[PDB]
């Protein structure tokens, strides 16, 4: 496309409301990260209160010394896991049939329990629910049960074939992403309709970059508690960063607040408020019968 | 690229 027309009748919830249910508004796609999961309390380490340098997250210092990060994954286990109104917003989408991928920081896996599946779902960052041997020749499969045994045994996990680490299959900081988000990015973003961006200040690599994929007439929606991914000044200096602002906007829109607000304001003004309501409230309910 | 901070 490459021409910046304006298909929002203006720039706010409600213009991406009557978007949302026009015809030609099909595919959308969501961006989220860790402000999607605070309010099921699996903390942000770059919120200023309750936020945790970064070696802990590293590769390199999680090769020598991998029993820091497990120490902590212990603190930060959460005793149940209760998908957020955020969540089950997106499994909305996926029911409706608006889903085309939701692209995720989090390696939660609560996208997977609110009902995402495989196919709707990219985990860039990966995630805990799988684990693997790290040995190349080994590469045994663990699930989280087992992690998790291990993490709360507060035994550094060891395989039972060879006694190499057992690494979550989460990305650390300096490791290169998973292939498929590169696949899937490149066919995702020539025919996405909107860009649902929830819950992160987009401040991560190449994960922040996936905004200027989309085209340049697809509507972005952020839902956040601060604005994220307009160009530096400097940085721009030496394309398609957020725009909310200008006079040049056109079809980037900020709800600052809680995600769980704003999906839960969104869907009221799209006449998904009850499904939603009951949803969660049924969701929750089924978990908290565990 | 690689996970970073940017
Ligand atoms: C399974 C349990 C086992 C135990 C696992 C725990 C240890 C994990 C190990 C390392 C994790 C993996 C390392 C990979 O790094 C990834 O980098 C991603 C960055 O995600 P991102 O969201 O960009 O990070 P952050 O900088 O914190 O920004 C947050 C934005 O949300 C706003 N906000 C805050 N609150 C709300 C709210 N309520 N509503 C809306 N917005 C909100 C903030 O103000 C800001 O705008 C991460 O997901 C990460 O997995
Ligand atoms: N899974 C998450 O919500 C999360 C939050 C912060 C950092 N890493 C992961
Ligand atoms: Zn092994």
Same mark, same amino acid.
């Given at each position: 496309?490459?021409?910046?027309?304006?298909?929002? #009748?203006?720039?706010?919830?409600?213009?991406?409301?009557?978007?949302?249910?026009?015809?030609?508004?099909?595919?959308?796609?969501?961006?989220?990260?860790?402000?999607?999961?605070?309010?099921?309390?699996?903390?942000?380490? &770059?919120?200023?209160?309750?936020?945790? @340098?970064?070696?802990?997250?590293?590769?390199?210092?999680?090769?020598?010394?991998?029993?820091?990060?497990?120490?902590?994954?212990?603190?930060?286990?959460?005793?149940?896991?209760?998908?957020?109104?955020?969540?089950?917003?997106?499994?909305?989408? %996926?029911? %409706?049939?608006?889903?085309?991928? =939701?692209?995720?920081?989090?390696?939660?896996?609560?996208?997977?329990?609110?009902?995402?599946?495989?196919? #709707?779902?990219?985990?860039?960052?990966?995630?805990?629910?799988?684990?693997? =041997?790290?040995?190349?020749? =080994? &590469?045994?499969?663990?699930?989280?049960?087992?992690?998790?045994?291990?993490?709360?045994?507060?035994?550094?996990?060891?395989?039972?074939?060879?006694? !190499?680490?057992?690494?979550?299959?989460?990305?650390?900081?300096?490791?290169?992403?998973?292939?498929?988000?590169? !696949?899937?990015?490149?066919?995702?973003?020539?025919?996405?309709?909107?860009?649902?961006?929830?819950?992160?200040?987009?401040?991560?690599?190449?994960?922040?970059?996936?905004?200027?994929?989309?085209?340049?007439?697809? @509507? &972005?929606?952020?839902?956040?508690?601060?604005?994220?991914?307009? !160009?530096?000044?400097?940085?721009?200096?030496?394309?398609?960063?957020?725009?909310?602002?200008?006079?040049?906007?056109?079809? #980037?829109?900020?709800?600052?607040?809680?995600? #769980?607000?704003? =999906?839960?304001?969104?869907?009221?003004?799209?006449?998904?408020?009850?499904?939603?309501?009951?949803?969660?409230? &049924?969701?929750?309910?089924?978990?908290?019968?565990? | 690229?690689?996970?970073?901070?940017?």
């Amino acid at each position: 496309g490459s021409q910046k027309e304006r298909l929002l #009748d203006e720039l706010t919830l409600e213009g991406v409301a009557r978007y949302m249910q026009s015809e030609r508004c099909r595919r959308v796609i969501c961006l989220v990260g860790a402000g999607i999961s605070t309010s099921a309390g699996i903390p942000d380490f &770059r919120s200023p209160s309750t936020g945790l @340098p970064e070696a802990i997250f590293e590769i390199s210092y999680f090769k020598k010394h991998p029993e820091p990060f497990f120490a902590l994954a212990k603190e930060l286990y959460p005793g149940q896991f209760k998908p957020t109104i955020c969540h089950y917003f997106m499994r909305l989408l %996926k029911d %409706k049939g608006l889903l085309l991928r =939701c692209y995720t920081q989090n390696i939660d896996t609560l996208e997977r329990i609110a009902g995402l599946e495989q196919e #709707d779902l990219v985990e860039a960052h990966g995630t805990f629910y799988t684990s693997h =041997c790290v040995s190349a020749s =080994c &590469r045994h499969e663990y699930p989280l049960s087992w992690m998790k045994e291990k993490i709360f045994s507060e035994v550094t996990p060891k395989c039972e074939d060879c006694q !190499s680490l057992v690494k979550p299959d989460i990305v650390f900081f300096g490791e290169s992403l998973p292939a498929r988000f590169f !696949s899937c990015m490149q066919s995702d973003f020539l025919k996405v309709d909107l860009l649902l961006v929830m819950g992160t200040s987009l401040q991560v690599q190449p994960f922040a970059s996936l905004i200027s994929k989309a085209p340049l007439s697809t @509507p &972005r929606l952020l839902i956040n508690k601060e604005k994220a991914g307009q !160009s530096d000044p400097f940085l721009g200096m030496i394309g398609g960063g957020m725009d909310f602002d200008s006079k040049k906007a056109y079809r #980037d829109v900020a709800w600052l607040g809680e995600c #769980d607000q704003g =999906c839960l304001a969104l869907a009221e003004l799209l006449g998904w408020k009850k499904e939603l309501e009951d949803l969660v409230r &049924r969701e929750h309910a089924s978990i908290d019968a565990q | 690229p690689r996970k970073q901070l940017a």
